[PDB]
Ligand binder design. Structure first.
Ligand SMILES: [Mg+2]
Ligand SMILES: [Mg+2]
Ligand SMILES: [Zn+2]
Lengths: 221, 166, 286, 154, 150, 294, 110, 44
């Protein structure tokens, strides 16, 4: 399945990339705050220009408000499994990660408040004409309070709590297809900082099995 | 053919209420087109009904029938699937709720007889179905005691009316 | 594949019957189903009962508080006063009181020897949820009842039924209402025994007190008949004797059971609830 | 009726039975541990015990040599019997072999047994071991034993 | 047959007729096609018969619904909750009148086997028979071959 | 003072109250990592819930065989009840009656059988007579019988139990076994234990001794059904482990001048080590002899 | 002799589901203390026995290399020596089969 | 629930001891009955 038939004039039309062009590493201790700066900004300004080229009426100031709307509405589709609307809000790279693990689970998610306004941390563009397509990725930082309660196939509470809101600091990356006349801005992926605090524990206990040794084999620590 | 047994692990129940009793997990697994007789397979499926997952596995490991190895193979992958994909906490906290065999798609072959005569030989296949329910195995029914019979007999005497009159 | 359409259609109808039987649909209010005109249904309700109800009062009798509070919640949710709907609380109280006093008068006149405790228990049974709900359901009261929840809760149904009695009381008066209570509540005693409606404990103790009130000697228990004494199916007839005169006799599977049953038989004779007592007179009052 | 019939009916008859048993015994002397159907190992175990007694007579005993020549189809094993196996059991009067039941054979579910000459150089079989003397039951009996011995000396 | 079908005892709805008689038929729902030939007799019944039938039975709410249908039907509902659907396909106006009048007189109970052609809650007025009803008593209630004062 | 029935209701309420308190200390569902160090299933790690998950829950993750055969747990080299919640990330091993050295398991079963005797003795005498529980002396298993020192009413100072009476106690013990009651454990501070056992003088003195031994003055409490007592160490999971159980003899300890302490004695074997009728009778005979703890 | 009538499923169920025909539950299954796998009380553990056989096979292949042909059985005793060990005083005069692995713990030197 | 026999759980040391113990009691029991007439016999 990796490649379609050979020597075929028709090719697969991809609408997104598989990864981030230049991964934005957030400064350590950014949660606490809740020369190189110019160099990164200049790279953003250059890339912003090629974004305003294809779409003249683009405003960086308006995006963080739009980014929040896309983010909230995308997560609300998970509550009612509105996959048809979700594809318009997220890319093909994000859609599997969001829905695959909850196919037979009930997700109750809600947006409570936004602690800090969203800030466009980085803006970058792809290499011109990868295969005739140019993409624009805008990394955004979100600090908001959310509530999540996941239930299993049998309606039993599996993760989180349904009424206790907790703080979330996550840098959502968006991506748009500039060349496409009908392309739009769509949640592309998420940056997980290495210093990010560990997620809340699950409810059930788990056992990690040891090595399954054949008779000839012997157990070595 | 029908493949309804595999679609029963896709039923998503609504979230339970705070005061409702915790619903036991139910796992449906089956193996299709086993080269073995359903009549012979029934005895092995009959053996482990109502048993705990660990007791059923022990009984099948020391059985000499060919179906025992196949059923043990099905029970193990069902046990793994229960904890991995169905949110079962303890792998040992499972019991055989249902276990039965079904007829598969079979093939016909010629069996030769003397005097130029023949018979039609069937190459038999079967299915095996198992349902695993979370929780301890339900206790067996205590033998009906003498007190129960005497109570039942007097009950029938007391429900006895004058028939064919006012 | 065979030509034709009729056989397929006929089979589709049966496939829908079996599908429905396997998965019976949740019950819904008769008002939500087709062929329903509330105003027409209200008028027929009175005509069936041969009662000249006031359509204004009768409609209010069916309105319950739960239906009003929920109706307002839906209005607020839709962002939509014109809902000044009067509940049946007032009518229910009037009907409930009248029914209890009316039933107490009917029962006191019929059985003058029953004490107040007995008559109260009979009135409580006749006006209870089980008896009232049974009568209300079989008179189309549930179909006309406006409630928040379906099936109508038993307490709500009982409240609505007595509201209808209150509406009749204002419309036609006490005499006309007394007949309604006689025809639909008093009838519920037709074949039922005294102690099937009035649940008592220790009948012998109650009997001893009654005979003291009547200045009669305490009853002496004696074995009148006996069969199968040593078997698993004995028969005992225990007779209660006052001054060496039989007042009651009762059978039982044991001497204790037979003795207690004899006391109940003695109580039934004392109060006038014997199985062979004069039946209730339902003839038109002269 | 088979009252008092101590020998089994195997192979293609009386001769084939001896040849079947002889092949098992020859393999046992070479390898010192073999696995075979339980009934066949049980029948051969008697011969394996008596072979050592003939080996103890010595290689100069003409009767012992003829017996060994018949029962050992591989002639390199006859020196082993007289010079390796028989000296090893010089200080024993019996119990030269141990026979244990192993899981049923995979193909035909035949009851299986492993037999070996004691004192071999091979990895030891997982012999069945009795419960430790330190268990609850064994400690209660040890006290009972101690008590009785104390009462007898008094 | 009786063994292959259910049965019940003769009974009434809320002791009907004891204090007063209440007609059990509560609602009638007709479905008559405007143009269907099978509904010819049902159309003729709605023009002259249904109006006079309603005057006589003011406790029955009749719902006439004219809609395209190949099989006209009448649905009768009773106070006890029973629902009966009766076809009037190709029936004459006289046949329909007879059917509608039959529905008006029925109680709504299941039309199944009735075990007894009578019912009563007080079958006995003098005391139901028991083995001692006609037996004489004996002095001191002594049993047969029983020595007294031993 | 409180009636006997009310005394249990008070003690159970205090026991239940302290249990609920310790559970609230747990912050949500903290996770501990328990590594399996047994010979079999080597390297198995259990990610369990702190202060809720017990060793029995770890056995449930493995197989039913662990649950049935495991009588006691060895947590970081220390014997640990199967139903005692684990408090930290640690190493865990499971002990059975048939281990090469089941000395610790023998003591646990040996202590538990004595506690079951105390339960029946307290509830066996008529309400008229007063039964005062003293202690469960630690006697070696090789002694032949487990003993439990009890002080009876002054009225029963010349009374010695009859054979039918001894059989009456045994039938009560077997009723406790048939009920299959778990051994619930609670490690509480001396202050909490002293409040539960205030009415009993012997327990107060006994509680004080155990608290003094440990720097933190925490005492181990155990409950079966409605009977609460103080123990010397970890116990077995359930009373259904016992199969053969009989109280053999009641001895009057000397000196009798201060108080007449009556030493009730019994012998028992679990299901896993049940003995033959003939062998069992020989054990009953030796159990009837007086044992002198050393 | 042929069947005079067809046998009903009701009759056949009584024959097939008779307790004699059913599989009996085994009460002699226990856990192996050494490995933890299941075993029967009177039968050796399958897992442990296989482990012993695998080592026995390895040693036998080494014996073959030393013998280097058929009809070459030794006239002296044999001792298996693993890496890091040398012949003892009692191992003198015995053929030494060297195994290129560490001595298994269950295999005790003698 | 698994069946058991007399020396199932006995160790190597206890099997000889139990055999000797029960054997001696049998012999002692038989020897104690060798004088029937001195042990309150029934009327002859
Ligand atoms: Mg031919
Ligand atoms: Mg043969
Ligand atoms: Zn093993």
């Amino acid at each position: 399945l990796v490649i379609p038939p050979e020597k075929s004039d028709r090719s697969i039309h991809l609408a997104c990339t598989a990864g981030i062009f230049d991964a934005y590493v957030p400064p350590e201790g950014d949660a606490r705050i809740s020369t190189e700066r110019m160099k990164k900004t200049m790279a953003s300004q250059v890339s912003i220009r090629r974004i305003k080229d294809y779409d003249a009426n683009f405003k960086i100031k308006d995006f963080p408000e739009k980014a929040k709307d896309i983010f909230i509405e995308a997560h609300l589709c998970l509550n009612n499994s509105d996959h048809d609307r979700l594809h318009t809000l997220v890319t093909e790279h994000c859609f599997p990660d969001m829905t695959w693990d909850i196919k037979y689970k009930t997700v109750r998610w809600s947006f409570v408040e936004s602690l800090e306004p969203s800030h466009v941390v980085q803006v970058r563009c792809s290499s011109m004409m990868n295969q005739g397509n140019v993409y624009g990725q805008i990394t955004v930082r979100m600090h908001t309070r959310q509530t999540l309660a996941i239930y299993d196939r049998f309606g039993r509470l599996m993760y989180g709590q349904e009424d206790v809101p907790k703080d979330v600091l996550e840098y959502v990356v968006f991506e748009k297809q500039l060349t496409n006349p009908y392309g739009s801005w769509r949640m592309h992926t998420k940056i997980v900082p290495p210093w990010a605090p560990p997620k809340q524990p699950i409810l059930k206990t788990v056992m990690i099995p040891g090595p399954q040794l054949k008779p000839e084999e012997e157990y070595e620590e | 053919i029908s493949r309804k047994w595999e679609k029963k692990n896709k039923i998503v129940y609504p979230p339970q209420l705070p005061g409702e009793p915790r619903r036991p997990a139910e796992i449906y697994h089956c193996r299709r087109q086993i080269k073995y007789s359903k009549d012979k397979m029934w005895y092995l499926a009959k053996l482990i009904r109502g048993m705990s997952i660990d007791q059923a596995l022990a009984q099948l490991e020391f059985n000499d029938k060919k179906g025992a190895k196949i059923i043990k193979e099905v029970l193990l992958e069902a046990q793994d699937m229960a904890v991995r994909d169905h949110n079962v906490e303890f792998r040992s906290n499972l019991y055989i709720a249902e276990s039965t065999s079904g007829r598969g798609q079979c093939l016909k072959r010629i069996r030769y007889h003397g005097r130029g005569r023949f018979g039609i030989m069937e190459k038999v296949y079967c299915h095996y179905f198992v349902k695993l329910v979370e929780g301890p195995p339900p206790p067996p029914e205590p033998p009906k005691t003498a007190v129960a019979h005497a109570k039942e007999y007097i009950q029938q005497l007391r429900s006895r009316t004058i028939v064919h009159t006012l | 594949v065979k030509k034709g359409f009729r056989a397929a259609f006929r089979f589709q109808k049966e496939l829908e019957r079996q599908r429905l039987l396997r998965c019976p649909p949740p019950p819904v209010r008769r008002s939500e189903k087709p062929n329903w005109d509330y105003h027409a249904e209200i008028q027929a309700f009175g005509h069936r009962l041969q009662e000249n109800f006031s359509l204004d009062l009768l409609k209010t009798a069916f309105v319950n508080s739960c239906y009003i509070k929920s109706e307002e919640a839906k209005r607020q949710q839709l962002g939509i006063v014109l809902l000044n709907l009067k509940s049946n609380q007032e009518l229910s109280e009037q009907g409930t009181s009248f029914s209890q006093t009316c039933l107490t008068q009917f029962l006191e006149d019929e059985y003058p020897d029953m004490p107040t405790e007995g008559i109260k228990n009979l009135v409580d049974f006749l006006t209870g949820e089980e008896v009232v709900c049974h009568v209300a359901r079989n008179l189309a009261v549930e179909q006309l009842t406006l409630s928040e929840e379906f099936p109508v809760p038993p307490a709500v149904l009982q409240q609505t039924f007595f509201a209808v009695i209150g509406a009749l009381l204002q419309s036609s008066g006490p005499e006309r209402t007394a007949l309604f209570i006689r025809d639909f509540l008093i009838t519920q005693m037709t074949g039922k025994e005294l102690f099937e409606m009035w649940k008592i404990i220790n009948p012998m103790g109650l009997l001893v007190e009654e005979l003291k009130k009547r200045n009669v000697s305490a009853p002496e228990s004696r074995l009148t008949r006996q069969s199968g004494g040593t078997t698993a199916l004995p028969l005992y007839f225990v007779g209660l004797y006052c001054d060496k005169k039989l007042i009651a006799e009762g059978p039982g599977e044991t001497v204790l059971v037979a003795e207690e049953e004899a006391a109940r038989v003695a109580l039934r004779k004392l109060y006038g609830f014997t199985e062979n007592r004069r039946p209730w007179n339902y003839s038109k009052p002269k | 009726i088979s009252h008092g019939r101590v020998f089994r009916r195997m192979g293609l008859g009386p001769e084939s039975r001896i040849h079947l048993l002889r092949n098992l015994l020859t393999g046992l002397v070479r390898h010192e541990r073999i696995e075979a159907p339980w009934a066949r190992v049980d029948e051969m175990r008697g011969y394996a015990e008596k072979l050592i007694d003939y080996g103890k007579l010595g290689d100069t005993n003409e009767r012992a040599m003829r017996m060994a020549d018949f029962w050992l189809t591989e002639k390199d094993l006859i020196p082993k019997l007289f010079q390796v196996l028989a000296p090893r059991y010089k200080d024993q009067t019996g119990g030269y072999t141990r026979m244990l039941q192993i899981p049923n054979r995979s193909l035909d579910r035949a009851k299986m047994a492993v037999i070996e000459y004691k004192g071999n150089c091979l990895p030891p079989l997982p012999l069945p071991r009795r419960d430790s003397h330190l268990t609850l039951l064994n400690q209660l009996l040890q006290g009972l034993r101690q008590d009785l011995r104390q009462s007898q000396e008094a | 047959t009786a063994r292959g079908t259910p049965s019940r005892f003769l009974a009434s709805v809320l002791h009907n007729g004891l204090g007063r008689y209440v007609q059990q038929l509560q609602r009638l729902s007709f479905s008559v096609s405007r143009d269907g030939a099978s509904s010819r007799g049902a159309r003729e019944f709605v023009e002259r018969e249904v109006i006079d039938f309603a005057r006589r039975n003011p406790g029955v709410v009749i719902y006439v619904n004219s809609r395209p249908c190949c099989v006209p039907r009448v649905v009768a509902e009773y106070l006890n909750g029973a629902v009966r659907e009766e076809s009037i396909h190709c029936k004459s106006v006289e046949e329909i009148s007879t059917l509608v009048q039959k529905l008006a007189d029925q109680s709504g109970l299941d039309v199944i086997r009735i075990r007894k052609p009578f019912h009563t809650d007080n079958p006995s007025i003098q005391g139901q028979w028991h083995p001692f009803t006609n037996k004489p008593t004996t002095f001191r209630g002594l049993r047969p071959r029983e020595v007294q004062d031993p | 003072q409180l009636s006997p029935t009310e005394l249990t209701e008070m003690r159970n309420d205090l026991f239940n109250k302290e249990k609920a308190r310790q559970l609230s200390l747990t912050p949500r569902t903290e996770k501990i990592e328990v590594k399996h160090v047994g010979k079999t299933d080597p390297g198995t790690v259990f990610v369990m819930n702190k202060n809720i998950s017990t060793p029995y829950s770890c056995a449930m993750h493995l197989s039913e065989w662990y649950c049935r055969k495991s009588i006691l747990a060895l947590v970081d080299g220390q014997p640990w009840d199967m139903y005692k919640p684990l408090t930290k990330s640690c190493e865990i091993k499971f002990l059975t009656f048939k281990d090469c050295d089941p000395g610790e398991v023998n003591k646990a079963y040996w202590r538990s059988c004595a506690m079951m005797m105390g339960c029946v003795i307290e509830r066996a005498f008529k309400d008229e007579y007063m039964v005062n529980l003293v202690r469960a002396p630690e006697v070696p298993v090789i002694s032949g019988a487990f003993c439990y020192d009890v002080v009876l009413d002054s009225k029963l100072d010349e009374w010695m139990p009859t054979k039918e009476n001894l059989r009456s106690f045994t039938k009560d013990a077997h009723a406790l076994i048939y009920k299959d009651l778990p051994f619930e454990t609670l490690e509480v501070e001396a202050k909490v234990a002293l409040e539960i056992f205030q009415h009993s003088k012997y327990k107060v003195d006994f509680i004080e001794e155990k608290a003094s031994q440990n720097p933190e003055r925490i005492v181990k409490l155990h409950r079966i059904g409605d009977f609460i007592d103080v123990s010397e160490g970890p116990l077995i999971p359930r009373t259904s482990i016992c199969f053969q159980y009989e109280v053999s003899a009641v001895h009057n300890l000397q000196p009798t001048q201060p108080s007449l302490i009556r030493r009730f004695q019994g012998v028992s074997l679990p299901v896993h080590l049940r003995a033959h009728f003939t062998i069992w009778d020989k054990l009953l005979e030796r159990s009837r002899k007086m044992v002198t703890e050393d | 002799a042929a069947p005079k009538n067809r046998r009903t499923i009701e009759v056949n169920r009584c024959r097939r589901r008779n307790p004699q025909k059913l599989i009996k539950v085994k009460n002699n299954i226990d856990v192996c203390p050494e490995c933890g796998h299941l075993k029967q009380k009177h039968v050796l553990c399958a897992y442990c026995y296989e482990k012993v056989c695998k080592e026995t096979a390895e040693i036998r292949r080494q014996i073959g290399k030393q013998e280097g042909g058929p009809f070459k059985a030794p006239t002296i005793e044999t001792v298996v020596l693993y890496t890091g060990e040398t012949p003892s005083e009692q191992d003198q005069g015995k053929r030494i089969i060297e195994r290129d692995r560490k001595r298994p713990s269950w295999f005790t030197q003698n | 629930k698994s069946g058991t026999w007399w020396d199932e759980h006995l160790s190597e040391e206890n099997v000889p001891f139990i055999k000797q113990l029960v054997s001696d009691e049998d012999k002692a029991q038989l020897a104690s009955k060798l004088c029937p007439l001195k042990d309150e016999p029934w009327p002859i």
